[PDB]
């Protein structure tokens, strides 16, 4: 029995926020997640 | 028995928020997720 | 018995929000997800 | 017995929101999902 | 017995929202999903 | 003057090749492209 | 003057090739393209 | 004058090649590209 | 004059190659590229 | 004059190669690239 499981080459997560004009009284929220496969 | 399971080449998640004009009294929310396959 | 399961080449999820004019008193919400196949 | 199951080449999900004129007192909501095939 | 099941080349889902004129007091909601075939 | 040009929500291109039976002395070639609109 | 041009929600291009029986001495070629509108 | 040009939410390109049976004396070539809009 | 140009949320490119059966005397070549918009 | 150009949230490129059966006398080549927009 041979097993190869739960792999990925490259994974990247991020966010870019830019304040250049206007007022921006609110918010700029970002929550990007990456989850692989869990074994049971 | 040979097994190859739950793989992906490249996975990327993110968001770009740009404030250049207007007021932006509200919000800019982003939640992108990536989940692979879980074993049971 | 040979098995090859739950794979994908490349997967990407994200959102771009741009404030350039108007007021934007509301919101700009985005939740894009990607889920692979789970084993039972 | 040979098995090849639940694969896809490339999968991408996202949204683009642009505020350039008007007021936008409301919302711009987007929830695009992609789910592969689950095994039972 | 040989099996090849639940595959697709490329799958993409998203939405583009543009505020350029008018008031937009309402909403712009989009929920596009893509689901493959599940095994039982 | 206000301008919004050359946008798309999500774009994905790929190919899946599976060798499970037969001989496959030939080839399996795939070249899928996606090009947006160019400005002049 | 207000302008909104050359947009699409989601665009995907791909191909699936499966070798399961026979000989396949020939080829399986696929070239699907997607081009948006160009400005002049 | 306000300008918003050449954007996309998420873009992904890839290929999955699987050798499980047969001989595969040939090839499995894939070249998927994605190009945005160029300014002149 | 305000300018917002050549953006994307998330971009991912990759390939998965799996040798599980058969001989694979040939090749498994993949070259997926992603190019944004160039300014002139 | 305000300028925001050539941005992306997250970008990832990679490849996964798995040798589990067969002979693999050939090759498994992958060259995925990602290029942003160049200014002139």
Curated annotation (Swiss-Prot), chains A, B, C, D, E, F, G, H, I, J:
It is found in: Cell membrane; Golgi apparatus. The glycosylation pattern (the amount of mono-, di- and non-glycosylated forms or glycoforms) seems to differ in normal and CJD prion. Changing residue 12 to V: Linked to development of dementing Gerstmann-Straussler disease. It comes from the Eukaryota. Belongs to the prion family. This protein is produced by a bicistronic gene which also produces the alternative prion protein/AltPrP (AC F7VJQ1) from an overlapping reading frame. The alternative prion protein/AltPrP (AC F7VJQ1) and PRNP have no apparent direct functional relation since a mutation that removes the start codon of the AltPrP has no apparent effect on the biology of PRNP. In mouse and hamster, the alternative initiation AUG codon is absent and is replaced by a GUG codon. Its primary physiological function is unclear. May play a role in neuronal development and synaptic plasticity. May be required for neuronal myelin sheath maintenance. May promote myelin homeostasis through acting as an agonist for ADGRG6 receptor. May play a role in iron uptake and iron homeostasis. Soluble oligomers are toxic to cultured neuroblastoma cells and induce apoptosis (in vitro). Association with GPC1 (via its heparan sulfate chains) targets PRNP to lipid rafts. Also provides Cu(2+) or Zn(2+) for the ascorbate-mediated GPC1 deaminase degradation of its heparan sulfate side chains. It is linked to PrP is found in high quantity in the brain of humans and animals infected with neurodegenerative diseases known as transmissible spongiform encephalopathies or prion diseases, like: Creutzfeldt-Jakob disease (CJD), fatal familial insomnia (FFI), Gerstmann-Straussler disease (GSD), Huntington disease-like type 1 (HDL1) and kuru in humans; scrapie in sheep and goat; bovine spongiform encephalopathy (BSE) in cattle; transmissible mink encephalopathy (TME); chronic wasting disease (CWD) of mule deer and elk; feline spongiform encephalopathy (FSE) in cats and exotic ungulate encephalopathy (EUE) in nyala and greater kudu. Creutzfeldt-Jakob disease: Occurs primarily as a sporadic disorder (1 per million), while 10-15% are familial. Accidental transmission of CJD to humans appears to be iatrogenic (contaminated human growth hormone (HGH), corneal transplantation, electroencephalographic electrode implantation, etc.). Epidemiologic studies have failed to implicate the ingestion of infected animal meat in the pathogenesis of CJD in human. The normal, monomeric form, PRPN(C), has a mainly alpha-helical structure. Misfolding of this form produces a disease-associated, protease-resistant form, PRPN (Sc), accompanied by a large increase of the beta-sheet content and formation of amyloid fibrils. These fibrils consist of a cross-beta spine, formed by a steric zipper of superposed beta-strands. Disease mutations may favor intermolecular contacts via short beta strands, and may thereby trigger oligomerization. Contains an N-terminal region composed of octamer repeats. At low copper concentrations, the sidechains of His residues from three or four repeats contribute to the binding of a single copper ion. Alternatively, a copper ion can be bound by interaction with the sidechain and backbone amide nitrogen of a single His residue. The observed copper binding stoichiometry suggests that two repeat regions cooperate to stabilize the binding of a single copper ion. At higher copper concentrations, each octamer can bind one copper ion by interactions with the His sidechain and Gly backbone atoms. Monomer and homodimer. Has a tendency to aggregate into amyloid fibrils containing a cross-beta spine, formed by a steric zipper of superposed beta-strands. Soluble oligomers may represent an intermediate stage on the path to fibril formation. Copper binding may promote oligomerization. Interacts with GRB2, APP, ERI3/PRNPIP and SYN1. Mislocalized cytosolically exposed PrP interacts with MGRN1; this interaction alters MGRN1 subcellular location and causes lysosomal enlargement. Interacts with KIAA1191. Interacts with ADGRG6. This is Major prion protein. It comes from Homo sapiens (Human).
């Amino acid at each position: 029995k041979t097993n190869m499981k739960h792999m990925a080459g490259a994974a990247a997560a991020g966010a870019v926020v830019g304040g250049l004009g206007g007022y921006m009284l609110g918010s700029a929220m970002s929550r990007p997640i990456i989850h692989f496969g869990s074994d049971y």
